[PDB]
Amino acid sequence: APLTYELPDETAQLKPAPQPGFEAAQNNCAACHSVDYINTQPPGKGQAFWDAEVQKMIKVYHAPVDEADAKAIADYLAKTY
């Protein structure tokens, strides 16, 4: 038989917020990687940092995210993280 490897369960979750971008981030930002990538970034980086992170995902890594959702997500992140 082949050898196999068992990963533990993923538990990482995004910080809830009343902004619509929270749900848009839930729906768009966990498809390629766990959201601990977001949770662990430097804190209080602000608007330009998170705008750039979101644009990189879409333009460089081809995340299927529309313009409206992209703004919502980047705004939710900049306010929350």
Partner 1 sequence: ADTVTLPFANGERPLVMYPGKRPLIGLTARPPQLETPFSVFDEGLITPNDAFFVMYHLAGIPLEIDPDAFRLEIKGKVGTPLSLSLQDLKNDFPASEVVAVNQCSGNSRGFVEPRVGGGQLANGAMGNARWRGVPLKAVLEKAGVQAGAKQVTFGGLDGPVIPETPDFVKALSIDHATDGEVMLAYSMNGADLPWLNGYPLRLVVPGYYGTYWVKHLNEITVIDKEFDGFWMKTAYRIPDNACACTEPGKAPTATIPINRFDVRSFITNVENGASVKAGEVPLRGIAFDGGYGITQVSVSADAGKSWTNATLDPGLGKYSFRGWKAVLPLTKGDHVLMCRATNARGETQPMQATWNPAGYMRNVVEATRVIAA
Binding-site residue ranges for heme c: 29, 32-33, 37, 56-57, 61
Output the CA angle 79-65-15, nearest 5 degrees: 30
Q: Which of residues 13-42 bind partner 1 (CB under 8 A)?
A: 31-34, 36-37, 40-42
Give me the DSSP letters along 37-62.
Answer: HHHTSPTT--HHHHHHHHHHHHHTS-
User: Does 59 participate in binding partner 1 (rule CB under 8 A)?
Assistant: no
List the binding residues: 29, 32-33, 37, 56-57, 61
Give the residue from 38, 42, 39 showing the smallest Cα distance to 57.
Answer: 38
Please report, as ranges, the residues that interact with partner 1 according to CB under 8 A: 1-8, 10-12, 31-34, 36-37, 40-43, 45, 49, 52-53, 60-62
